[PDB]
């Protein structure tokens, strides 16, 4: 596992992990074993703690810290508390008669491990939320600490993303295969696969209506839509069985219409309209995101639909993915940092219709040099990426959370000369869901 000794290496702390996942019901407990020597503890006891520390920049740091967790393990049993776990008990396999363990628990609504990025000349201040398991030995809790008697680990809490999206992806690939198919066999196989995917998706529930009742009217409408979709798949499959491939392809093209019906109901969209004087008709703009939950590094494709009847041409399209970070503290300020920018010289004739799909990807390596970003750890570490979006409170408090991180996509249209019309699409970025010893030191 992982270990780390004090500057006076007479006190060694082990842990089963360095990163702990947040289950909304209950975070995993912290299991560890404390190895000491009673001779150096002639009249003294070893201590363990856990705090949700706050950092900035006696290191010239302002602090607003709130959590306490106490389990002392010398002797290990004042009372036989022992809510034991398998690895914690088995860790005595190689450890002698001084190794007494500990067990901790984290509240299920604490903020995750987020850290803002400062710099020599930064657009934002330095702040962060991080956890620490600190161990030490002295006569009592209130006694002054010392550096030759301390081990201070730093652990991390991570939220992982929560079937319908996979089913829709399968349907999209099967539809493309259907369009590109040339014989009846591939058509039939694709139709079978999409029928299975559509049924499986109909068995599921959408994220937006989760709080509503299972028998609520919205769920009825959703299942009705998937019923229509499966019926159209059935018609295409029957035509494919008859062998007439072209009619099957048209019946599959009808699935485009039913998918368009589903999208405007259950996917992020936005539409703003603007008009000017000395004209007759206004300008209309629309955009849509394919999905809501995104994975770090997964490209984001942004549909753009534009129509116009004005007397002005437009040759510019700008698509961006913008950071948004909150600081729920006394220094309250708000931030916005484009993580990925896009530019094309596409066409807006005075009277014409345009629709193309553009793909973007927020990535830290290309976007590193700017300051004030939102990260989840030290930049030097390999497991450090951008900050996953702060899952909003389920009606809980906001001030105590500290740092809220969110993402949304902007599409801008550059009005020609003789504001610039824009839409926004909120979305979500998240990470996808004997003993050998090692050192904890990062």
């Amino acid at each position, epitope marked *: 596992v992982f270990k780390k000794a004090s500057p006076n290496g007479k006190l060694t702390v082990y842990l089963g992990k360095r990163d702990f996942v947040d289950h909304i019901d209950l975070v995993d407990p912290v299991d560890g074993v404390v190895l000491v020597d009673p001779e150096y503890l002639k009249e003294r006891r070893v201590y363990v703690t856990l705090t949700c520390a706050f950092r900035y920049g006696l290191g010239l740091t302002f602090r607003k810290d709130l959590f306490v967790a106490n389990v002392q393990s010398f002797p290990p049993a004042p009372e036989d508390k022992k809510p034991l776990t398998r690895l914690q008990e088995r860790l005595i396999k190689k450890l002698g008669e001084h190794a007494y363990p500990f067990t901790f628990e984290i509240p299920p609504n604490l903020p995750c491990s987020v850290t803002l990025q400062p710099g020599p000349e930064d657009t934002g201040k330095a702040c962060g939320v991080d956890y620490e398991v600190k161990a030490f030995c002295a006569e009592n809790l209130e006694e002054k600490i010392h550096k030759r008697n301390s081990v201070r680990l730093v652990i991390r809490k991570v939220q992982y993303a929560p079937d319908l999206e996979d089913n829709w992806e399968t349907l999209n690939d099967n539809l493309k295969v259907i369009e590109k198919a040339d014989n009846a066999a591939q058509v039939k196989d694709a139709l*079978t*696969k999409m*029928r*299975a*995917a559509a*049924l*499986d998706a109909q*068995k599921a529930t959408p994220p937006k209506l989760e709080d509503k009742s299972p028998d609520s009217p919205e769920m009825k409408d959703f299942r009705h839509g998937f*019923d229509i979709l*499966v*019926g159209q798949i*059935d018609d295409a*499959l*029957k035509l494919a*069985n*008859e062998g007439k491939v072209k009619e099957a392809q048209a019946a599959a093209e009808q699935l485009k219409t039913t998918r368009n019906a589903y999208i405007q109901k259950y996917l992020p969209t936005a539409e703003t309209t603007r008009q000017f004087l000395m004209s007759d008709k206004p300008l209309h703009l629309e955009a849509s995101l394919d999905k809501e939950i995104y994975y770090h590094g997964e490209p984001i494709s942004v549909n753009v639909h534009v129509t116009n009847n004005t007397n002005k041409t437009v040759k510019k399209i700008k698509i961006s993915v913008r950071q948004y970070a909150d600081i729920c503290l006394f220094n309250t300020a708000q931030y916005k940092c484009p993580v990925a920018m896009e530019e094309a010289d596409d066409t807006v004739a005075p009277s014409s219709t345009f629709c193309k799909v553009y793909t973007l990807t927020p990535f830290l390596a290309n976007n590193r040099e700017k300051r004030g970003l939102a990260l989840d750890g030290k930049l030097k570490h390999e497991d450090t990426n951008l900050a996953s979006s702060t899952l909003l409170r389920e009606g809980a408090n906001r001030e105590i959370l500290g740092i809220i991180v969110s993402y949304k996509v902007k599409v801008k249209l550059v009005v020609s000369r003789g504001s610039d019309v824009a839409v926004e699409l909120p979305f979500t970025l998240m990470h996808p869901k004997d003993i050998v010893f090692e050192d904890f030191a990062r």
Partner: antibody
Amino acid sequence: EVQLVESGGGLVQPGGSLRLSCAASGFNVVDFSLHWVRQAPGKGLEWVAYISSSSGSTSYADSVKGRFTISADTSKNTAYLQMNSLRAEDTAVYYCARWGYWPGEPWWKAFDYWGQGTLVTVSS
Amino acid sequence: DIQMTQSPSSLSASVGDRVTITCRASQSVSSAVAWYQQKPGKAPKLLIYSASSLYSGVPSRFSGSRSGTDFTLTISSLQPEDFATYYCQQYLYYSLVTFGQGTKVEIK
């Protein structure tokens, strides 16, 4: 009540023809689909063919693709199966089964009401 | 064609014991699996449809569970009617129906 009466079996020389009739009572054929499920003696069940009277669509099996012919009759609540050039492998007892339509529970309940079955035998 | 296979080709159990019968799909069929209990020389009977749901009339000591593409059935066997061959059918589409090789529950 629901009863799937299946009759029309017998012994036929190789290359001969037979007409297996599946009569239904207690429900009209215009509301459900009708299949055929084989059973070889001492083996598992096997799918044969089916018909749906709401669309006239029929599909057969890879073993009896070019030989059998299925046709329904709404006014009599019977769906006819036609045997042509029966081989030796078709010496199996045949069942008639009913399957609902897509929208709703009936599709999910696959083959809720079967038939007693008739036995056909092919020998030289 | 979607293929159905039953692994425990024969089971031996006595009255009152617990019996489990498995099935494994070769392709993703969202539920769409039904189990039939074929008595010696009798037509199949519908026990469990939708891969988990019960059919009215069938006794209550029958249940199923789906995990990925693997389907299982569980009984608390009684004397008269729980000793026969059981089957596993996939019914995704009208012209895609394939049955599984049966399994027999003898008496020790």
